[PDB]
C-alpha cells in the first residue's frame, strides 16, 4: 500500500505521482524515534499554583527574588522598565495556558510525547557546574527574557522566508516553544533550579543543536516503516477488537459488524 512514500527535501509527503499527503511530516517535522513523554508543567494545577510559582512581582519586596541567589540584587526593586517585560511574559504564559488548555490538549492530561528533553540538560549542567551553592549569581532577568524570546525564533523546521514558510514555522513549533516557556520561565529558573549565566548559555546552545538533530531525515521511507510498525503488534494481538477489527478498518467495509455511537448529552 505505501511502498513509495518518501519525505523529500521540503518536509512533505508525496507518492510516486506527487499526491502530497501531509504537508509537514507527522505534523511536526520530527523523527519518530526521537521523542520522550514529558510534562508540560503549565497545564495542570490551579490558578493559585500558577500565580504562586510564576507570577513575578517587582514592587512588593517579598514576592520577588529572595536576594541570596543573585549578585546584582541591589539593582532591582521597583523598576517598571523591567516589570513591563515580566508582565508581558506573564500574559504570554497566560496566553500559552489558554492555548494548551483550550485548543490543543483540552482534557488537560499533560503528559505527551514531545522532543528533546531539556530537564535532563539542565541537571546535566548542574552536575557539571557543581550547582549546589546557595550563592549569588550574576545572570540578569532581561538576559533570561531575551534568551527565551530569541530562542523561539531560532527553531527552524521549515527554512526559507516566504509568508507560508514563516506561518508554517509558527504553526510547526508552537507546542515545543510552549514547552520551553512552560519550563524555563524566570521564577522557575532563578528560584527552583538556580542556574548561573554560563549554564544558561550552554542550555541555549544545546537546545539549538538537539532540536536540530531530531528533525526527520529526508528519504525516511516512512510508509514502509509505518506499515511494518503497525503490522508488528498485529502479530501479537462487547465490541470487536484485534485482528478482524483491524481488517475491517483497512479493507474498509460498508458493513462492519457492530458499529457504535459516542453520544454526549448537554450540560444541564
Amino acid at each position: 500500500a505505501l511502498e513509495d512514500i518518501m519525505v523529500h527535501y521540503d518536509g512533505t509527503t508525496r507518492n510516486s505521482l506527487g499526491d502530497i499527503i501531509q504537508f509537514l511530516y507527522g505534523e511536526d517535522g520530527l523523527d519518530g524515534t526521537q521523542v520522550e513523554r514529558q510534562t508540560i508543567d503549565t497545564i495542570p494545577g490551579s490558578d493559585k499554583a500558577f500565580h504562586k510559582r510564576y507570577y513575578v512581582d517587582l514592587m512588593d519586596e517579598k514576592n520577588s527574588i529572595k536576594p541570596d541567589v543573585i549578585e546584582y540584587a541591589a539593582d532591582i526593586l521597583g523598576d517598571v522598565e523591567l516589570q513591563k517585560e515580566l508582565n508581558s511574559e506573564y500574559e504570554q504564559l497566560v496566553s500559552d495556558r489558554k492555548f494548551l488548555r483550550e485548543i490543543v490538549f483540552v482534557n488537560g492530561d499533560h503528559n505527551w510525547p514531545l522532543p528533546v528533553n531539556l530537564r535532563r540538560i539542565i541537571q546535566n549542567a548542574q552536575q557539571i557546574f557543581h550547582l549546589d551553592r546557595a550563592k549569588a549569581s550574576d545572570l540578569t532577568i532581561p538576559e533570561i527574557i531575551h534568551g527565551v524570546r530569541d530562542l523561539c525564533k531560532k527553531l527552524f523546521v521549515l527554512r526559507g522566508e516566504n509568508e507560508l514558510i514563516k506561518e508554517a514555522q509558527q504553526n510547526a513549533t508552537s507546542l515545543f516553544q510552549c514547552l520551553v516557556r512552560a519550563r524555563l520561565a524566570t521564577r522557575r529558573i532563578l528560584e527552583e533550579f538556580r542556574l548561573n549565566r554560563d549554564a544558561f548559555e550552554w542550555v541555549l546552545g544545546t537546545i539549538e543543536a538537539q532540536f536540530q538533530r531530531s528533525l526527520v531525515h529526508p528519504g525516511e521511507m516512512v510508509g514502509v516503516i509505518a506499515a511494518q510498525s503497525i503490522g508488528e503488534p498485529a502479530t501479537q494481538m462487547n465490541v470487536t477488537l484485534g485482528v478482524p477489527r483491524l481488517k475491517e478498518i483497512l479493507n474498509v467495509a460498508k458493513n462492519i459488524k457492530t458499529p457504535a455511537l459516542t453520544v454526549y448529552l448537554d450540560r444541564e
Binding site: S16, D19, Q22, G223, I225, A226, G242, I249
Partner: protein, 107 residues
C-alpha cells in the same frame, strides 16, 4: 479513523507513535474518499503501471497497460527494482556529482 486505529491497537497495552498512525490515516484519505487497501484502491490509481501490477491481478492490469498506451515514467519503486535500477530513496533518492568547485580548490 485515527481514533479507531489508536483504540484497537492500544487496547492490549501496546503503544504507537502518533506520526505512523497519522501517515496511515492521511493516505487513507488522500483523494477525498477512502482509498481502501485492496486491489480496488491502489490499482484504480493512475500511478505507475508495474507498481500496480506487482500486487494483484497482473494479467488483466498488464492488458490494460498495453491496451491504452500508458506512459509509465517508472518513478514507482517496484518498477525500479524489476528494471534493476537505482531505486529512488535512501542513498538513491539523489544523484552525486563531481565538483569543479572543490577540485579547483585542490592542487
Amino acid at each position: 479513523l485515527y481514533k479507531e486505529i489508536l483504540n484497537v491497537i492500544a487496547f492490549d497495552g501496546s503503544y504507537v507513535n502518533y506520526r505512523h498512525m497519522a501517515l496511515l490515516v492521511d493516505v487513507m484519505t488522500s483523494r477525498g474518499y477512502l482509498m481502501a487497501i485492496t486491489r480496488h484502491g491502489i490499482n484504480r490509481a493512475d500511478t505507475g503501471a508495474l507498481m500496480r501490477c506487482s500486487f494483484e491481478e497482473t494479467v488483466e492490469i498488464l492488458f490494460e497497460a498495453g491496451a491504452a498506451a500508458e506512459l509509465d515514467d517508472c518513478r514507482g519503486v517496484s518498477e525500479n527494482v524489476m528494471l534493476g535500477q537505482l531505486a529512488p530513496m535512501g542513498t538513491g533518492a539523489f544523484d552525486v556529482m563531481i565538483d569543479e568547485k572543490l577540485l579547483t580548490s585542490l592542487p
